C-alpha cells in the first residue's frame, strides 16, 4: 500500500499543476506576439475570404 | 438459509441465518431479567463466538443486517453496558460486528454516519482488555471467507488513523472532537496501536505508515525500528526487510518538510545500521549530507577490526565513490592512524584508483576525431575549444597540442579559452601539467592566466591523500597581486577539489572574496568559486559570502553582469541545505530595495526546495505581476528591472528541478513539460523574459533527469532556430549527452541543421558548433548526469558550473567558463585484491517491473550482455549482478549506482 | 423596451428621449438616470453594435451631461 | 455626476481564478502541511497578535444589522 502511494504522488501533482497551468496560458501564448503573430493573421484572413 | 430447527447442527446454522435462537430471544431476556443468570450467559459467550465464525462464510447483507438488529438495539436499550459492569464489557465482543454490519453491509446513509462515532469509543474501551486487538486478528488473518470482511476490518482500522490525524490540524484534540469521541493519547489506546502494528506488518503493509505520519514524531519511526531488526533474517531475508525501509524516507519524502524530513531519515539509516548490510547504510547516509552519519558507517568496519581483512579495503571503496570528495577527505587519516599499510589504503579512497581505470576503459573505446578543420578568423577559436569537448575526461590526443601553430593563432580572451581546453584533453590526470607549463613562462599575461584554469580541470582527479593537490600550485597565484591571474587560480581551485572543504583550501577563501569596492567584473569568480566549494555537504550559509554581496550594491550597479553573477552565486552557496536556508531569506530581505529583491526569489527555491508547492505558486505569480500592474494603468530604473525579471525565470527552473530529483519518482516525465509552458506563457507575457526562459529550458532538463529524451529537445530545437541566442543549443545538448549515441544523434543531424545551414554572422556559428561536440563522447567513453547516479534522487556538486551558464546573454567572456564541464561517471569493473579491471557479466534492464520500487531494484530476469561495458543511462539505468551462476557474490550492492563493482569468489 | 427595441431607429428616438426627460436630474431623485446613462456608455464602448445603435448612444449621453449640468 | 472607468478588473478576475484551481491541485501536500505549521503559532503568537485564533475569528456572534444609514 505505502509503495503504491509513493508512485500515487508524483503522478497526480505534477500534471495536475501541468493542466492547471496550460488552461491559464491560453490566453498567454498571444500576449508576447500579438504583432508579429496577429499581424500574420491579418495578412492570412485577408486574401482567403 | 431457510429455517430448519434443531434437527443436525448442520440445520443450527442455517436456522440462525434468519433468526438467532441462541444469541437475540434467550441472550435478551436473560440479561433483562435475572442477574443470577450473568453466570450462564460468560459461558454462553463461546457458543456465539462460533456462531459468527460458521454463518461468516455466508455474505448477504440481509442474513446479518436483520439477524442482529435487536442486539444492536440491546447496547443501550436494555443493557445500558453498565447494568452488570464486567458482564458486558466481555460481551461486546460479539455486539461490535453487529454494529459495523449497518456501517459496512448495509448502506443507510444516516446510520453509516452516525455509527461510524460509537464504533471508534467502543473500540478503545476493549482495547483495554487486549481482546479488541484479537477481534480484528481473526478478520486479518482470516478464518472463512465473506465479501464483507475484506472491507469490514478497515472500518475498525480507520478508527485509529481518523483521531491522530485531527489531533494536529485541529489543535483541540482528544475526546473534545465528537467526530471520533476517543482520547489521541493515554495508556489505553497506546498499547492498542503498538499491538495492531505488530499483525498488520506481518500480514499487510498498512497502518503502520498512518500512526507514523499522524504522531508527526521521529518517536513513532524510532518504535518501527525494534520490531522489524528481529524480523531481519528469521521472518524473512534481509532484502525484504529494505524494501520497507528506503521506502520509508521515500514514500513521505516529498512530505516532510525540512525539520520533519531530516529526523525520519536518521531512523532510516539506523535501522541499515543494525541490520546486515552496511552497504544500505552509506546510501542513506550520503542521502543526509551529515558529516556524523558518513563517520559512523566507516569507522563501523574500519576500527573493530585489528587485522587488514576484508575490512579496510571495504571502507576505502565505500567513500571513494562519491566524486564530491566529501567523502573522501573525512575517511583519509584513519587509515594513517592504524597504520596496517598507507600505500594501498590512501590511494584507494582517493580518485587517483579511478584515473587507472579509465585506461582499461578507454582501451575499448579507442579514439575517432571529428573535429573542426577551420581556421583564421573567429572560427579558429571555435575549433581549438572544440578539440577539448570531444577528448573530455582522460584522453591522449598529445602531439596535436604540442603543434603550436593553431594554439598560437588564438587572440584575446581566446588564449585563455584554448589554454583551458587543452587542459580539459587531461582532466581527470596526473599527466598534462607538461603542455601547460610551456604557455604559462613566456608571451603575454592572457596565456599564464588560461594555464591556471587548466591546472584546475586536470586536478580535478587528483588531490587527495597529499599527491599534487591543486592547492599547491594554485597559492602562488592567489599571493601575486594581478587580478587577472589571481582570479583564475581561486576558480580552477574551486573545480578540483569540488564538494571537498579541506582546511587548507577552505582557509585560502576566507579572508578573500570581501573586496567588490574596487569596481572589476572578474571579481565575479571571487563569490563564484567558494559557493561551488560549498555544496556537496551541509553550509554554514558563511558570512564572508553574505557580507560581500551587500557590500558589491552600495559600490557600484554600472556593471550589470557583475551582480547578476553575485546574485546566483549565493543560491548555489545554500544548496546542500534547506532547514537553514529559511533563516537567511529573511535576513536578506531585512535590507529591502528592488534590487534585492531579485536575490530573494532565487534563495525562496533552496529553503522551500524537496517541499515545493507553495514554491511552485509563487514562482508563477512572480512572472504574472509586471503585466497585471501594467493591465492597472490600460484601464538607474533599467538595472534594477533587468535583475528583477530574470533572477525570477531562472528561480522558477531551479525550484522544479531540486525538487523532481528528491521526490517519489513517475513524475519526471511531467517536470519538463511545466516548462514548456512557462515558455507557453512567454511562447505571445514578458518579450525580453523569452531571451531568458529559452536558455533556462536546457538545463531544466539535465537537472531533472527527463525519461523522454528522444522527442521532447528536438521539437523545441526547431522553434528556437528563428528565435535569437543559439546558447539554447548548448543548454539542450547537456541533457541530450544520456547513453552516447542512443538521444544524441538526433541531435548531432539537428543541431548540424541550423548550424552548416545558416550562416550569417560568425559570433551565431560559434555557439552551435561548440554544442554539437559537447554532446558525443566517441562509443560511449563515460557519460554525464547531474544526478550522482550512486543516489538517483542524489545531484551532483561539479555540475553545478554548467548549471550556472545560461543566465545572461553570450559572451566571448562566458566562453572561458565553458570549458569546465567536469560531472564524470565510472564504468564498473568487478575487483580482486589484485584490482581485476574487468567486469564477468551484467544484466541491464531499460524499465524495472517492480510495482514494489520505483528506483527499481533490478529484476533478476533482465537482458544480459557482455564483459566492461559503461553503466547504461536512461533505458538502461537498472542493473542486476550477473556472477551467481559462476557463483560470486557482491559485497557491494549495485543497483545501477556509480559504484565499482567488488565480488568476492570463495 | 424602446430602448431594446427589435428595430435601431426606435432606439436612437428613445434614448435622447430618456435624456431629455431626465436632463440634469440626480441620482438621489429617480435612481434610474444612472442604469440609463451606464447603458450609452456601454453602447460607445461596444464595437458590436449597429452604428445607427452607437449615433443614438453619442448624441442621448452629450443631451444628459448637456450645458454644464447647469441646464 | 460622473466618470466611469474601470477595465483592470479583466486582469484581476484571471489570475484570480487561477489560484483557486491551483490550490485543488496542491491538496495533496497542503494537508501535511498544516499539522507542522499549527503547533507553531499555538506555543508563539498568530504573527504579533495573540488573537484571532481563539475561534474561527474571534467572535461566533450575530453580525446582521438593518436600518442602518440614511432613510
Known amino acids: 500500500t505505502r509503495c503504491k502511494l509513493k508512485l500515487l504522488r508524483m503522478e497526480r501533482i505534477k500534471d495536475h499543476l501541468l493542466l492547471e497551468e496550460e488552461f491559464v496560458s491560453n490566453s498567454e501564448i498571444l500576449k508576447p506576439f500579438e504583432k508579429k503573430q496577429e499581424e500574420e493573421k491579418k495578412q492570412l484572413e485577408e486574401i482567403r475570404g | 438459509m431457510v429455517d430448519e430447527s434443531d434437527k443436525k447442527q448442520q440445520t443450527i446454522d442455517e436456522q440462525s441465518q434468519i433468526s438467532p435462537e441462541k444469541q437475540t430471544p434467550n441472550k435478551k431476556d436473560k440479561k433483562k431479567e435475572e442477574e443470577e443468570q450473568l453466570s450462564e450467559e460468560d459461558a454462553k459467550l463461546k457458543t456465539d463466538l462460533e456462531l459468527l465464525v460458521e454463518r461468516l462464510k455466508e455474505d448477504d447483507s440481509s442474513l446479518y443486517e436483520a439477524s442482529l438488529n435487536a442486539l444492536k438495539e440491546s447496547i443501550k436499550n436494555s443493557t445500558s453496558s453498565m447494568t452488570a459492569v464486567p458482564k458486558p464489557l466481555k460481551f461486546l465482543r460479539p455486539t461490535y460486528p453487529d454494529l459495523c454490519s449497518i456501517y459496512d453491509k448495509w448502506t443507510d446513509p444516516n446510520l453509516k454516519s452516525s455509527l461510524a462515532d460509537v464504533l471508534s469509543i467502543l473500540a478503545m474501551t476493549y482495547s483495554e482488555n487486549g481482546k479488541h486487538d484479537s477481534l480484528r486478528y481473526r478478520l486479518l488473518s482470516d478464518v472463512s471467507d465473506f465479501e464483507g470482511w475484506g472491507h469490514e476490518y478497515i472500518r475498525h482500522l480507520a478508527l485509529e488513523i481518523g483521531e491522530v490525524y485531527n489531533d494536529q490540524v485541529e489543535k483541540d484534540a482528544e475526546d473534545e472532537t465528537s467526530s471520533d469521541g476517543s482520547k489521541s493519547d493515554g495508556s489505553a489506546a497506546t498499547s492498542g496501536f503498538e499491538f495492531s502494528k505488530e499483525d498488520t506488518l506481518r500480514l499487510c503493509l498498512d497502518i503502520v505508515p498512518y500512526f507514523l505520519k499522524h504522531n508527526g514524531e521521529e518517536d513513532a519511526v524510532d518504535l518501527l525500528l525494534e520490531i522489524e531488526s528481529i524480523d531481519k533474517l528469521p521472518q524473512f531475508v534481509d532484502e525484504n526487510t529494505f524494501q520497507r525501509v528506503c521506502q520509508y524516507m521515500v514514500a513521505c519524502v516529498p512530505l516532510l518538510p525540512p525539520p520533519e524530513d531530516v529526523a525520519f531519515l536518521k531512523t532510516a539509516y539506523s535501522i541499515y545500521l543494525s541490520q546486515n548490510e552496511l552497504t544500505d547504510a552509506i546510501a542513506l547516509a550520503v542521502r543526509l549530507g551529515e558529516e556524523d552519519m558518513i563517520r559512523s558507517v566507516f569507522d563501523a568496519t574500519s576500527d573493530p577490526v585489528m587485522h587488514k581483512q576484508l575490512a579496510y579495503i571495504l571502507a576505502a571503496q565505500k567513500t571513494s565513490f562519491e566524486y564530491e570528495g566529501v567523502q573522501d577527505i573525512i575517511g583519509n587519516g584513519k587509515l594513517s592512524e592504524h597504520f596496517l599499510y598507507l600505500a594501498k589504503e590512501l590511494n584507494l579512497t582517493g580518485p587517483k584508483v579511478p584515473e587507472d581505470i579509465y585506461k582499461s576503459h578507454l582501451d575499448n573505446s579507442k579514439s575517432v576525431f571529428s573535429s573542426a578543420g577551420l581556421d583564421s578568423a573567429q572560427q579558429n577559436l571555435a575549433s581549438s575549444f572544440v578539440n577539448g569537448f570531444l577528448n573530455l575526461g582522460y584522453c591522449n590526443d598529445k602531439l596535436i597540442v604540442d603543434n603550436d601553430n593553431w594554439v598560437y593563432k588564438t587572440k584575446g580572451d581566446g588564449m585563455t579559452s584554448a589554454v583551458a581546453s587543452i587542459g580539459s584533453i587531461y582532466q581527470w590526470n596526473l599527466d598534462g601539467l607538461q603542455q601547460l607549463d610551456k604557455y604559462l613562462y613566456v608571451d603575454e599575461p592572457e596565456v599564464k592566466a588560461g594555464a591556471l584554469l587548466g591546472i584546475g580541470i586536470s586536478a580535478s582527479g587528483v588531490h587527495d591523500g597529499e599527491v599534487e593537490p591543486a592547492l599547491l600550485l594554485l597559492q602562488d597565484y592567489v599571493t601575486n597581486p594581478d587580478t587577472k591571474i589571481s582570479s583564475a587560480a581561486i576558480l580552477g581551485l574551486g573545480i578540483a577539489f569540488a564538494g571537498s572543504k579541506n582546511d587548507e583550501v577552505l582557509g585560502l577563501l576566507l579572508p578573500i572574496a570581501a573586496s567588490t569596492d574596487l569596481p572589476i567584473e572578474t571579481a565575479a569568480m571571487a563569490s563564484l568559486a567558494l559557493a561551488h566549494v560549498f555544496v556537496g555537504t551541509c553550509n554554514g550559509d558563511i558570512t564572508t559570502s553574505i557580507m560581500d554581496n551587500f557590500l558589491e550594491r552600495t559600490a557600484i550597479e554600472l556593471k550589470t553582469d557583475w551582480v547578476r553573477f553575485l546574485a546566483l552565486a549565493l543560491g548555489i552557496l545554500y544548496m546542500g541545505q534547506g532547514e537553514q536556508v529559511d533563516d537567511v531569506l529573511e535576513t536578506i530581505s531585512a535590507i529591502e530595495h528592488p534590487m534585492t529583491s531579485a536575490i530573494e526569489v532565487l534563495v525562496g527555491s533552496c529553503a522551500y526546495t524537496g517541499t515545493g508547492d507553495v514554491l511552485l505558486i509563487q514562482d508563477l505569480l512572480h512572472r504574472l505581476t509586471p503585466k497585471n500592474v501594467k493591465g492597472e494603468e490600460d484601464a538607474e530604473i533599467k538595472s534594477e528591472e533587468k535583475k528583477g525579471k530574470s533572477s525570477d525565470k531562472d528561480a522558477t527552473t531551479d525550484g522544479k528541478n531540486d525538487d523532481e530529483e528528491e521526490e517519489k519518482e513517475a513524475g519526471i516525465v511531467d517536470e519538463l513539460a511545466y516548462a514548456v509552458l512557462g515558455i507557453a506563457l512567454i511562447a505571445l507575457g514578458e518579450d525580453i523574459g523569452k531571451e531568458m526562459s529559452l536558455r533556462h529550458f536546457g538545463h531544466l532538463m539535465h537537472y531533472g533527469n527527463e525519461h523522454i529524451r528522444r522527442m521532447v529537445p528536438l521539437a523545441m530545437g526547431i522553434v528556437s532556430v528563428s528565435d535569437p541566442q543559439m546558447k539554447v543549443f548548448d543548454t539542450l545538448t547537456r541533457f541530450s549527452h544520456d547513453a552516447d549515441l542512443e538521444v544524441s544523434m538526433n541531435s548531432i543531424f539537428a543541431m548540424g541543421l541550423c548550424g552548416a545551414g545558416t550562416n550569417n554572422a560568425r559570433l551565431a556559428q560559434l555557439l552551435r558548433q561548440l554544442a554539437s561536440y559537447y554532446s558525443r563522447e566517441q562509443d560511449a567513453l563515460f557519460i554525464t548526469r547531474l544526478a550522482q547516479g550512486l543516489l538517483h534522487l542524489g545531484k551532483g556538486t561539479m555540475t553545478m558550473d554548467v548549471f550556472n551558464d545560461a543566465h545572461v546573454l553570450n559572451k566571448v567572456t562566458l566562453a572561458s567558463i565553458l570549458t569546465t564541464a567536469v560531472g564524470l561517471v565510472s564504468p564498473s569493473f568487478m575487483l580482486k585484491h589484485h584490482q581485476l579491471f574487468y567486469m564477468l557479466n551484467a544484466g541491464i534492464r531499460p524499465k524495472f517491473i517492480l510495482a514494489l520500487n520505483d528506483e527499481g531494484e533490478p529484476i533478476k530476469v533482465n537482458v544480459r550482455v557482455g564483459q566492461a561495458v559503461e553503466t547504461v543511462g536512461q533505458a538502461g539505468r537498472p542493473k542486476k549482478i550477473t556472477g551467481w551462476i559462476t557463483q560470486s557474490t557482491p559485497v557491494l550492492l549495485n543497483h545501477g549506482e556509480r559504484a565499482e563493482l567488488e565480488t568476492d569468489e570463495y | 423596451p424602446l430602448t431594446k427595441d427589435p428595430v435601431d431607429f426606435v432606439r436612437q428616438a428613445a434614448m435622447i428621449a430618456l435624456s431629455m426627460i431626465l436632463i440634469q436630474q440626480t441620482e438621489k431623485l429617480n435612481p434610474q438616470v444612472a442604469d440609463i446613462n451606464k447603458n450609452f456608455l456601454s453602447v460607445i464602448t461596444n464595437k458590436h453594435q449597429e452604428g445607427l445603435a452607437k449615433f443614438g448612444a453619442c448624441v442621448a449621453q452629450g443631451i444628459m451631461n448637456a450645458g454644464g449640468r447647469n441646464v | ?71
Open chain 4, 1 to 71: 455626476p460622473r466618470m466611469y472607468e474601470e477595465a483592470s478588473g479583466k486582469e484581476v478576475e484571471k489570475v484570480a481564478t487561477a489560484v483557486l484551481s491551483t490550490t485543488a491541485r496542491a491538496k495533496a501536500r497542503a494537508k501535511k502541511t498544516k499539522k507542522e505549521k499549527g503547533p507553531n503559532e499555538e506555543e508563539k503568537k498568530k504573527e504579533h497578535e495573540e488573537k484571532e485564533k481563539e475561534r474561527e475569528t474571534n467572535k461566533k456572534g450575530i453580525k446582521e444589522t438593518k436600518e442602518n444609514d440614511e432613510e
